[PDB]
Amino acid sequence: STSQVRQNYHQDSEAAINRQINLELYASYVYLSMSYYFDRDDVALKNFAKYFLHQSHEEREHAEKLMKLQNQRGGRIFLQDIQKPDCDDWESGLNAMECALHLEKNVNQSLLELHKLATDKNDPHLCDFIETHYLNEQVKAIKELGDHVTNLRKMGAPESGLAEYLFDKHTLG
Amino acid sequence: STSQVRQNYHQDSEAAINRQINLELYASYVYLSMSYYFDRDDVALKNFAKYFLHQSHEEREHAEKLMKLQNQRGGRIFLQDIQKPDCDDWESGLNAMECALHLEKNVNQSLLELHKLATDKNDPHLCDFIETHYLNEQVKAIKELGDHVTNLRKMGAPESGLAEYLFDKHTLG
Amino acid sequence: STSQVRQNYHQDSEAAINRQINLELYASYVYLSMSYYFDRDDVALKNFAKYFLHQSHEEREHAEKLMKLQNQRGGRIFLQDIQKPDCDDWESGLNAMECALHLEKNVNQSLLELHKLATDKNDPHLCDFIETHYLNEQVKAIKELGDHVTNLRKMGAPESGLAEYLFDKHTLG
Amino acid sequence: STSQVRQNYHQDSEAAINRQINLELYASYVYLSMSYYFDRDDVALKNFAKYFLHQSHEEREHAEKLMKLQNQRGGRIFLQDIQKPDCDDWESGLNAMECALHLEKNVNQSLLELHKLATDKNDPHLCDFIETHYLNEQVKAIKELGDHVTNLRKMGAPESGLAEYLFDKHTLG
Amino acid sequence: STSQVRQNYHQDSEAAINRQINLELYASYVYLSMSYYFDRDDVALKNFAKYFLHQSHEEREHAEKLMKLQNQRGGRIFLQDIQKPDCDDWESGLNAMECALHLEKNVNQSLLELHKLATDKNDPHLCDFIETHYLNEQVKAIKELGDHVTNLRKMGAPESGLAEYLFDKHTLG
Amino acid sequence: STSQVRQNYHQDSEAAINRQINLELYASYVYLSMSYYFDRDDVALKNFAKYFLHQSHEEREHAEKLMKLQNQRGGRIFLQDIQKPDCDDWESGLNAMECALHLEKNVNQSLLELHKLATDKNDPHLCDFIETHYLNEQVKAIKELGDHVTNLRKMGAPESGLAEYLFDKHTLG
Numbered sequence A, B, C, D, E, F: 001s002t003s004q005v006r007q008n009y010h011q012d013s014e015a016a017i018n019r020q021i022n023l024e025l026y027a028s029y030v031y032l033s034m035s036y037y038f039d040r041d042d043v044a045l046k047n048f049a050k051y052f053l054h055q056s057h058e059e060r061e062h063a064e065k066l067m068k069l070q071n072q073r074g075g076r077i078f079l080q081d082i083q084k085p086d087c088d089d090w091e092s093g094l095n096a097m098e099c100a101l102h103l104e105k106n107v108n109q110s111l112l113e114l115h116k117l118a119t120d121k122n123d124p125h126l127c128d129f130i131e132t133h134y135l136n137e138q139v140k141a142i143k144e145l146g147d148h149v150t151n152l153r154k155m156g157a158p159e160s161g162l163a164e165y166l167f168d169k170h171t172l173g
């Protein structure tokens, strides 16, 4: 039953990877929802829509890289339901950016816990995988989202629809 | 509350589109599972893996086009959980192809019912959307999968691991 | 008297096509009026002017394609007066966009009725002509105009002349 | 016995497709006859000959696309004898064009009946296949042939051998 | 109420320009009718059709340039109904050319009266606008149409359908 | 009644050419049937299908060259019904290749008889036409088909579906 390739790969690490795969797919689905919210005729912020669609695809890529990891190490992927996002209506560009920031920080926290587990199980390959492909990506994403939220707030979002319009044009466009 | 763009778009059609979006996302997730099954070290059919990964991405594209439709017509997207696939282990190239064929026929049946609803609601735009973007795509996908299943069976899959190996190389490669 | 090419083309369909030709020419004339309203020295929104002039030419193209249809089927074109637009003065970028949206929805309703007639007369060629060349075009135009109206309103049009200025620059330019 | 790919494809539709295949092959053979009539030394209208030969090959393509359809849907092709054309000697450029027009209208009528059957059997894929690939093609072919017949008649065919000569040169050449 | 740009622009000139705009749009519509007459399957003179369609578009360009003039001078455009053309059926290539010649001479007469008004109101800008953009254009158009009519008549139009055929090919093609 | 170009062209030769035209069209139709047999979802040998479709088109070309011959010599083409092929279902790649070989040998025998007739009628032009365009073509086709049949048999067709699969890939692909 044990994979011929498996070496120094703890069952707990395998399970945590499966959980991270689900979380990445969940994040992808959240971003998809946000994108198409901004595509609504009564919201109509095309560059917000594009920004979040790109993020959705990137999150899918992250999940697939974790699946590849799982198979490389000889673990077995076990997929779960991808839960629907918390909202259907994201209310504003600013609110969407804040929710994205919160999501990214949650994903980062899960990654940090994964790293802690890898460290505890003396799995340096897994640790460096997380470090190389995930942690800096998260730090960058969080910094970018924080920058966006800051600009929107200073511009006067969400009450200034002009604010969101011009942010859509000049930052996200 | 009614969208400014909405015209000749029945609530039942809107709901059916939301169901189709979920079904397309489900199909994408099924194909993702199959792809990474073939990426396992104890299965190791890279071109099967690639074939199903491509199909997964294509299904995601189909879902996104339906979401775009929904917003174009002034309906509102309501996302649901994406259920996990029926299997974790797809057993063989042939079995995966047969399950894919079954899935594609189920998706096609749902599309046909959607078309019937559009027709009943006298929604020619929706009918032609389905016709143009979905129905022929489905017919082609079903024919291709049937061709694959036929070849694998004639070659001697799934007992002939040589059969699947050579199919992976010569058809899917 | 009956055209040598005519086949499965009902008199009622022919008459409805003649009405649609007139409606398309009318829409082209409305858009022409709007364009040159924005060219006034006391309005001076060049990109609004360009947007509506492009729309005018596109509507002319639609009418000409219907005339070509009529001759292809062996019907006979009967032209009518092109009525002058409802306004000389369109008041604002937002008001013009709202009137354009209303016009586009009226044109769409007429197209839907034309499709219904074709269906009732079992004229699949005519149905698919309408579907292929007109219905999606209308859906897109309505969605775009709705997006424009939404943005202008959120920006603060028509009281914010800055709003219309910046929309002219960043969206229509 | 039922094809693994077959879905929503009525036996009556399958039979009608087989009949249409035969009709398209028949039309191809008629045009072949006309082409080589104009290649006779005592007729000697090379561009008529080329025009009808092109039409013959196009009709063959139409038949082959229907065969491909049949297999795509999981129906089974049953071929029949291709009947010889009604004439060996087509008498004149004008007479050939009139017979071609009559043939094209007969083919169109058969296509319309096929569409009606598809509609009655709620086969939207088949309907849109016919609509996309056949109906407009027929309308165009009929209009072109009607234009040709009109010009020949106005020029003075078939008594003015100069008429046919110059039509061969300037229209068909 | 007076435009900030208006200078040396008499109310009578403004009104005459509005009348000329309507006349140019009328001429465009007449030429459109003629074009699609020649597109009929029972007339079938493609190059006549093209010639008149080009003329239609050119006349629309003339109208739009007058509208631009009106706004440049600070007058206000007031559009009127575009009357339907005098005929639905233009009978022959020659008859259409003669009606076009008559139309062009009427347009020219109106332009000459406009010039006379400009001169009487000491509006040298308007005079030179008319001179530069319109008068020579009209002279050329009238000369060309007269040349066409002369050739058709000498060839034997409209009784020689060969005449019109060959004119369509060699002059208009 | 006798063609102005006819010289040294016996009535018996003319009749034999008409028979050969029909036989070539028959062969084309047989190959068409075989091609689309291999396009079936339950057969699914794309390169067999392509091979036989190419052969079908080549046979049509042969028939058309014979028609051109007939007119060049001043004979008159008389077309007959094209009989349907002997089978609807060709059973296997090997069986299809064997039937094709048999067909090609029958066509060759008919050509040899045609040559014998030409020789007996002292028609060296006809003899050399047959020699140049047909006889070597037939010899090559027969040799190729024999090679194919030999390979399939040695590989283990038709019981080894792997055999036909790999032949389709490596020889016909």
Ligand SMILES: [Mg+2]
Pocket: A128, A131
């Ligand atoms: Mg490190």
Ligand SMILES: [Mg+2]
Pocket: A166, C166
């Ligand atoms: Mg700005």
Ligand SMILES: [Mg+2]
Pocket: B128, B131, C128, C131, D128, D131
């Ligand atoms: Mg359709």
Ligand SMILES: [Mg+2]
Pocket: D166, E166
């Ligand atoms: Mg000449």
Ligand SMILES: [Mg+2]
Pocket: F128, F131
């Ligand atoms: Mg020799």
Ligand code: NA
Pocket: A024, A027, A059, A062, A107
């Ligand atoms: Na991520």
Ligand code: NA
Pocket: B024, B027, B059, B062, B107
């Ligand atoms: Na799909």
Ligand code: NA
Pocket: C024, C027, C059, C062, C107
């Ligand atoms: Na339109």
Ligand code: NA
Pocket: D024, D027, D059, D062, D107
């Ligand atoms: Na056809």
Ligand code: NA
Pocket: E024, E027, E059, E062, E107
């Ligand atoms: Na003019």
Ligand code: NA
Pocket: F024, F027, F059, F062, F107
């Ligand atoms: Na042959």
